[PDB]
Structure 1
Amino acid sequence: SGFRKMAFPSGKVEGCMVQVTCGTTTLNGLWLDDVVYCPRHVICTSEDMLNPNYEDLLIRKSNHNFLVQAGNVQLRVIGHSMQNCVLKLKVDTANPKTPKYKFVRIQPGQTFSVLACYNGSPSGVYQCAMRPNFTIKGSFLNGSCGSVGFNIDYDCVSFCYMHHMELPTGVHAGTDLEGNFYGPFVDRQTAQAAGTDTTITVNVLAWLYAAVINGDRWFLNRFTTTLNDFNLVAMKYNYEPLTQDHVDILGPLSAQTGIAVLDMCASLKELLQNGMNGRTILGSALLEDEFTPFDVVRQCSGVT
């Protein structure tokens, strides 16, 4: 029993983190096989970031200008290329700790673990969600760029995020491992404002199922609702619309608990309308939306 915001064990990813330095800029790279992946803004000064021409800046860079260090050992860079907003530095040594891996582009509402790193060295691990406005709410200081987000399926690491940018409102933007930003963000120090940070309704419902499984039940009520009625209330509270696809995904939790998805939606509707009245659910005073239904099943079943 108990339900915690849980990250994947980080060891497989710790074995991939390296330091990348270009001139005066140091950040993190991801070493998989004989390629190191890092934000292309490693080539920029803070001055450059106001209006960078990355193709032009990259002409002035040679393989020997990219200093790649794996622990206290230097890697030899034998090639470099820009793909979207990442650089791929080809090194002469395959990472001997390369796990089975995939690159995946996740959807808003999907969760992942972040291994926050500085100078190629892991500092901490935490659990994030891709927000509906394609920001993440991370913990990233100067030097954390190139830190990655991932999921693990048994022994395969699915890398889904690389950290690039903090917006002026202190939320974070980054790319998949093909270098494509999530959402509309760019690697330039400019006016970029995030849209509405809506609540991931299907994840809240999953977490309410987790609450019932773990004995927090006070919010269960005598009501039901319909998707259309629920969505009228969701929309008023800046919740994502619930779809039949979401209902289908919640089916296993519904089955485990015997609480129909639409009955849980009616519980959630009352919590939105009435608030918590000073009560807590799984140690939270707000409705938690960074657990997916898969997360809840995984954690409630003890998957390794």
Structure 2
Amino acid sequence: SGFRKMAFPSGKVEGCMVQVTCGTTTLNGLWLDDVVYCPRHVICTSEDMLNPNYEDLLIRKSNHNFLVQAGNVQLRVIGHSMQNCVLKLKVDTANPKTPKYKFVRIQPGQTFSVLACYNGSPSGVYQCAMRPNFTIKGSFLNGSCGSVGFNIDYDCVSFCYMHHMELPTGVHAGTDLEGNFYGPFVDRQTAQAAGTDTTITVNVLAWLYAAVINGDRWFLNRFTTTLNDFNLVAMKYNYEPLTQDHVDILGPLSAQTGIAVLDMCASLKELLQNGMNGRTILGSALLEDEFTPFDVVRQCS
């Protein structure tokens, strides 16, 4: 029993973190076969960050301006190029610990594990969700840029995030491994803000099922509702709309517990309208929305 925010084992990704230095800027890179991936803003100075011309700043640079350190070894850069907001440094040596991997882009609401690193050195792992506003509530300090997010599906690591920047409200923004930003952000020092966030409704429902599986039942009631009726309640409380696709995904938990999704939505309706009345659910006073249905099934079964 028990339910914890759980990250994937990080060993396969630990074997790929390197330190990348360009001038004064030092940050983290991802070393897979003979290429090191890192944020292109590693080439920027303080003057450059205000309005960088990346194609221009790069063409003036050359291989030897990139110091790549894998643990105690120096890797020598034999080539460099850009893909979107990611810098790709071809190196002389393939990483012998390259795991089976894919680059995937995740959808808001989906979860992944983050290996936080400093100076190419992994320091911690935690689980988070891509928010509806495309930010992540991470925990990062200076030098975390180029830390990566990932899922593991079957010895295969699916790399989905690379950290680029912190926003003024303390949350974080980054790209997929092809350099495409999540959300309407740019890698430049300008005024950027997270949009108003919303709650991931399908994930809250999943977590309620987790709580039922773990013996927490007080919020269940005799009522059901409809998709239309509930989605009016969701809109009112800044929850994402619940779609039919969401209901189908939850299908397994609805079977395995005997509470149907609209049955469970009725509980969530009630929790939203009346609160928790001093009680908790899985040790939380808040409705938790960073567990997917899949997260719940994998951890609970």
User: How many Å apart are 1:194 and its aligned residue?
Assistant: 1.4
Distance 2:25 2:278 in 1: 47
Residue 46 (structure 1) shift: 2.8
Report the secondary structure of 1:229's partner residue. Answer: helix
Tell me how far apart the structure 1 counterparts of residues 280 and 106 of structure 2 sit (CA, whole Å).
Answer: 30
Displaced runs of 4+ in structure 1, greater than 6 A?
A: none
55-64 or 19-28, which moves further after superposition?
Answer: 55-64
Equivalent residue number for residue 250 of structure 2: 250
Partner residue in 2 for 1:260: 260
Q: Which residue of 1 aligns with 2:11?
A: 11
Please report the TM-score for the alignment, with normalisation by the length of structure 2: 0.99
Matches of 1:168 and 1:52 in 2, distance apart?
20
Distance, in Å, in 2 between the alignment partners of 1:190 and 1:283 is 40
Where 2:28 maps in the other structure, the secondary structure is strand
Deviations 1:255-299 (A, max 9, x none): 110111100000001011111122111111101100000000000
Larger mean CA deviation between 202-211 and 185-194 belongs to 185-194
C-alpha displacement of 1:47: 2.8
Q: Cα offset for 1:238? A: 0.4
Comparing 175-184 with 45-54, which one deviates more in the overlay? 45-54
1:52 Cα offset (Å) = 1.1
Tell me the CA shift for residue 174 of structure 1: 0.2
Could you tell me how far 1:27 is from its partner in structure 2? 0.2
The CA deviation string for residues 230-271 of structure 1, in whole angstroms up to 9 with x for no partner, is: 000000100000000000000000011011110000000101
Superposed CA offset, 1:159-178 (max 9, x none)? 00000011111111000000
Q: Distance in 1 between matches of 2:279 and 2:125?
A: 29
Q: For residues 22 and 230 of structure 2, what CA distance do their matches in structure 1 show?
A: 52
Tell me if 1:107 matches 2:121.
no
Cα distance in structure 2, aligned partners of 1:151 and 1:206: 19
Q: Secondary structure of the residue that 2:232 maps to in structure 1?
A: helix
Q: Deviations over 1:198-242 (max 9, x none)?
A: 000000000000000011111111211101110000001000000
Q: Mean Cα displacement is larger for which, 202-211 or 276-285?
A: 276-285
- Cα distance in 1, alignment partners of residues 290 and 300 from structure 2: 15
- Give the CA deviation at 1:9: 0.4
Give the stretch that moved more between structures: 268-277 or 105-114. Answer: 268-277
> Alpha-carbon deviation of 1:66?
0.6
Tell me how far 1:56 sits from its aligned partner. 1.4
> In the alignment, which residue of structure 1 is the partner of 2:149?
149
User: How far apart in 1 are the matches of 2:279 and 2:7?
Assistant: 26
Instruction: Calculate percent identity across the aligned residue pairs.
Output: 100
Determine the structure 2 residue equivalent to 1:177: 177
- 1:78, CA displacement in angstroms? 0.5
CA–CA distance in structure 2, aligned partners of residues 288 and 50 of structure 1: 38
What is the alpha-carbon root mean square deviation over aligned residues? Answer: 0.7
User: Which sits farther off after the overlay, 218-227 or 45-54?
Assistant: 45-54
User: SS where residue 47 of structure 1 aligns?
Assistant: helix
Gaps of at least 5 residues in structure 2 are: none
Question: Superposition pairs for residues 57-206 of structure 1, below 5 Å?
Answer: 57-206=57-206
In 2: Cα distance, 1:48 partner to 1:214 partner? 53
- 1:1-29 deviations in Å (ceiling 9; x for gaps): 00000000000000000000000000000
Q: Give the SS at the match of 1:263.
A: helix
Q: Structure 1: any 5+ residue segments left out of the alignment?
A: none
CA distance in structure 2 between the aligned counterparts of 1:295 and 1:158, rounded to whole angstroms: 15
Q: What is the CA-CA distance between 1:76 and the residue it aligns to?
A: 1.2
SS in 1 for 2:46: coil
Deviation at 1:154, TM superposition (A): 2.0
Shift of 1:53: 1.0
After TM superposition, give the deviation of residue 101 of structure 1 in Å. Answer: 0.3
Offset at residue 60 of structure 1 (A):
2.2
